[PDB]
Design a protein around this ligand. Structure first.
Ligand SMILES: Nc1ncnc2c1ncn2[C@@H]1O[C@H](COP(=O)(O)OP(=O)(O)OP(O)(O)=S)[C@@H](O)[C@H]1O
Ligand SMILES: Nc1ncnc2c1ncn2[C@@H]1O[C@H](COP(=O)(O)OP(=O)(O)OP(O)(O)=S)[C@@H](O)[C@H]1O
Ligand SMILES: [Mg+2]
Ligand SMILES: [Mg+2]
Lengths: 455, 94, 450
DNA sequence: AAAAAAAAAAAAAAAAAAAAAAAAAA
DNA sequence: TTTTTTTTTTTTTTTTTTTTTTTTTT
């Protein structure tokens, strides 16, 4: 209707995939299956590289505790820890190389394509020798083969020459401007995409306050104005901070109003609350102000402000000048029949193995559905989400609730599992993508369910 | 690795047999009248239903059931004594 | 046929299980199954409490990074974080309570039992108000009901008096003496049971040498003899050499018995240890040669020895006198048909989701087989091992190979699964234990087949 | 094509709190 | 015989320093 959805994704000399490959994705949810160690996570990494400013590769393997891969390894395509010898036999492509990836989104009578080109020039491995160029396309005649053709008969100048004569093409040599243009195009909050990357492999909740203070909410600190006033040689700072707190509370009210419709465990749902706490240096500063009002000693306020500004990474400064650090967050469970608390939780400590997964998935999708366009009203302009190693620890019953909630929130999803589960996916999806490895090469096959059934 | 097990069909068949018989049924007769495709994964579901609906599960006496898989052979199961009936679990969601 | 194998385990007022409960375990291995949030982890925590001096509870849920629950929470039976108010509806037993555990081993006729009784007195909840008493016996006519009746008749005075009024029982009010006696009974190494506790929830490997220096190998450093020699105002090096030769001799046999299993379609593993030389030894040799060629230069040698004995927590001096630190460990993959090295590795960094699990399982089971029999006399006296959330991130073939590896070394194992992978289990297992929970109370049922 | 300023992630260390075991007094 | 006092060990939390990569200017 008015929401873009992923439809296809292509590769060239990326990771273990050599040559040219592609896969098609149905607009009613698909699943990715294949044996252990075949290439399922590589496609996800290739997609994530195009969106966030600093990806976390291979996140789901450790459960959300550590990332263990780098871009150059994918570009040159290593296949293990090697052996140690004269010839580095464990590296696939050595010397001069070239690599290109691209993903395409689609809507009702529209099309947008993203892309990237990366290439070496000599025998080196430093991260500063990997020349890069990002792209954004609107016209239908642009295609990956066209970009490779242009590069092979020129260079950076040849690629940049496309904008002069063509249409609907914008190459950006710096990733920062690329991401700024992207966010402006989709009308999306500043930290939505990093949240999307984080939601792929996170399976715990140490504390929800960190999640709300780092990802969901924006950043409107007041350090600069404080420094300006300090160097001018004041209550307006406090008025500004109070106004920011009020706006934060209104936004949180909006979110918890939205979260009601979806259903938790039967007869129950969730509500989010926040309390106000004042402590630390606020009392000291107020005392100093009231003491100076008696009369000199004007340098006391300047000293306090400068000390707070200098130590910008301490709890005193954060609690003094950052409005989003003047609240405390916790989640609660409400029974539908009437209204009464059943349990209030501030984290996920002490739970069972399967309860942590459902809690984390529910809260993450609830926050993400709001971080997208409906933050500023209207329906989302970018609806899709990726899950990795889905349903690793839960039982049969919990997966149904997860899928039902995901459908109710209004998002399209792709699931990535080994052959562990084959019934629910057949019941709720429409298309499948099969991967396979033979030696050191991997390939993709796309089929619907009926064709595989006929075998 | 398709098919596997179908829970809904097994539940429906068990309910139909129970409402048809109209008398308490132990595990041995239920297995004999409706042999399972897999020897396991079936007794577990029945025991889960028995414990959930609240039927007592006696454990001081034993019942013996003999089965043969697809590739011949024999298996002897030392199941406990459970009495299922339609009335107890007629109005519980699943 | 001289190995003790787990056969039974009993509970009373533990966790969510209220009143008496029981479970049986087959000599060929079993498999506990049940829905999510049923009580499977509680049953194995009850066993882990009796063995390690400092348990890690609920280890598998977080993947092997943290722990969440504590002992006093189990005894009072907390179910969830609750809410505000004062009734504390989320706590089951309030006021005076009493709890009991047991476990049984059988090898051939001979039988042993392990025990514990814990209780409160009032409405306090501090960890210092929880009385404790540990038991160990090898005679019949001593069951859980007997201990509970004796405790009700009197108090700890009545309990601790059973030793004089009987035969074959030994009460220990201090856990350290209890564990020392237990370790002496089975002739296992010093940290075998801690390794067993760790192996139940570890699905990731970071460095082999950490494990081989912290848990598997015992401590035989020569700090005392060196300090004595320094204060006397060299056989030390020969002693160190002998101790580093013994390790190589054991590793040879371990590799020989690991050779028979296929880590992959045509490949098998092997452990490799290499020798390193630090600068500290060079200085000592130089001092020795200088003293020999001098003929007073004795001050420097004694100063070096005294410095070594002083800061015994720096790798500079620790690597001089601790034979465990003179070696370096790593694994390698070798294929048959013209034995040829193909890959060497020192940790599971950068691997796939399923490769880490199998690597960790192989290394840990090899380490356990080493620890449970320190010398070449063979005949382990303890032969069980448990796994939690078995085969959670792998495919069919990987699970098959893991099970084959476990069966090769000669270990009796039990598996825990959230009602999954039944077809694979049914071939290699001949029992089951089903746990179901309604409302707030849990229950156990038992099966078998042949 | 080369030199400078800024930002994000990893590693080591100091401070603090809680629990277990042995010695001493009523 | 029962209670109290002391020491020792283990774990957690916060702060500072270091390194690498990206972007900008000449
Ligand atoms: N940077 C890298 N370093 C080492 N090995 C790599 C790297 N990138 C890919 N591989 C190899 O690629 C294979 C795993 O990649 P993938 O197939 O994407 O992982 P996977 O599909 O997630 O496997 P599962 O299903 O999660 S167990 C293994 O053979 C790895 O050795
Ligand atoms: N200390 C505790 N704090 C909070 N809840 C607890 C605690 N001990 C037990 N419970 C509850 O008791 C239930 C018993 O489940 P567990 O045995 O801990 O996990 P489980 O049965 O293994 O579930 P999984 O998904 O199979 S790991 C838990 O789900 C909690 O709801
Ligand atoms: Mg993966
Ligand atoms: Mg568990």
């Amino acid at each position: 209707s008015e929401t873009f959805i992923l439809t296809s994704i292509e590769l060239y000399n990326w990771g273990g995939f050599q040559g040219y490959h592609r896969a098609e994705i149905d607009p009613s949810g698909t699943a990715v299956i294949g044996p252990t160690g075949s290439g399922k996570t590589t496609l996800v990494d290739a997609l994530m590289t195009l969106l966030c400013a600093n990806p976390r590769y291979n996140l789901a393997s450790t459960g959300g505790h550590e990332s263990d891969r780098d871009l150059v390894s994918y570009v040159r395509g290593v296949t293990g820890p090697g052996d140690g010898g004269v010839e580095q036999s464990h590296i696939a492509r050595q010397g001069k190389t070239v690599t290109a990836i691209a993903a395409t989104l689609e809507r009702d009578g529209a099309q947008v394509r993203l892309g990237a080109v990366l290439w070496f020039e000599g025998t080196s491995s430093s991260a500063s020798d990997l020349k890069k160029l990002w792209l954004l396309s609107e016209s239908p005649e642009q295609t990956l083969e066209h970009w490779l053709s242009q590069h092979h008969a020129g260079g950076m100048r040849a690629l940049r020459q496309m904008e002069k004569d063509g249409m609907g093409i914008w190459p950006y040599p710096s990733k920062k401007a690329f991401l700024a243009r992207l966010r402006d195009y989709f009308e999306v909050g500043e930290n939505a995409f990093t949240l999307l990357n984080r939601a792929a492999g996170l399976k715990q909740l140490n504390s929800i306050d960190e999640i709300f203070r780092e990802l969901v909410l924006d950043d409107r600190s007041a350090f600069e104005r404080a420094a300006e006033v300090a160097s001018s040689f004041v209550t307006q700072l406090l008025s500004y901070i109070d106004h920011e707190v009020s706006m934060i509370e209104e936004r949180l009210d909006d979110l918890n109003s939205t979260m009601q419709r979806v259903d938790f465990q039967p007869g129950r749902y969730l509500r989010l609350v926040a309390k106000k706490v004042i402590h630390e240096s606020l009392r000291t500063l107020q005392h100093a102000q009231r003491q100076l009002n008696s009369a000199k000693a004007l340098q006391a306020l300047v000293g306090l402000l400068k000390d707070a500004c200098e130590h910008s990474r301490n709890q005193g400064a954060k609690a003094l000048l950052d409005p989003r650090f003047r609240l405390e967050f916790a989640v609660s469970v409400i029974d539908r029949e009437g209204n009464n608390l059943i349990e209030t939780r501030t984290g996920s400590q002490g739970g069972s193995g399967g309860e942590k997964e459902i809690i984390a998935s529910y809260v993450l999708t609830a926050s993400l559905s709001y971080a997208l366009c409906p933050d500023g009203s209207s329906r989302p302009l970018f609806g899709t989400i990726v899950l990795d190693q889905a349903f690793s620890r839960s039982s049969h019953a919990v997966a149904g609730r997860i899928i039902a909630a995901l459908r109710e929130f209004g998002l399209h999803a792709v699931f990535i599992t080994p052959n562990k589960e084959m019934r629910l996916l057949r019941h709720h999806t429409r298309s499948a993508v099969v991967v396979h490895r033979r030696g050191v090469e991997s390939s993709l096959v796309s089929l619907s369910w009926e064709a595989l059934d006929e075998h | 690795a398709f098919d596997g097990l179908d829970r809904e069909a097994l539940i429906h068949d068990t309910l139909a047999v129970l409402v048809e018989q109209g008398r308490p049924v132990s595990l041995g007769e239920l297995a004999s009248l409706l042999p399972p495709a897999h020897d396991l994964e079936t007794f577990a579901l029945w025991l889960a239903m028995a414990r959930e609906a609240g039927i007592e599960v006696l454990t001081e006496e034993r019942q013996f059931v003999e089965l043969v898989d697809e590739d011949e052979q024999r298996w002897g199961f030392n199941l406990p004594y459970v009495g299922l009936d339609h009335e107890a679990l007629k109005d519980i969601d699943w």
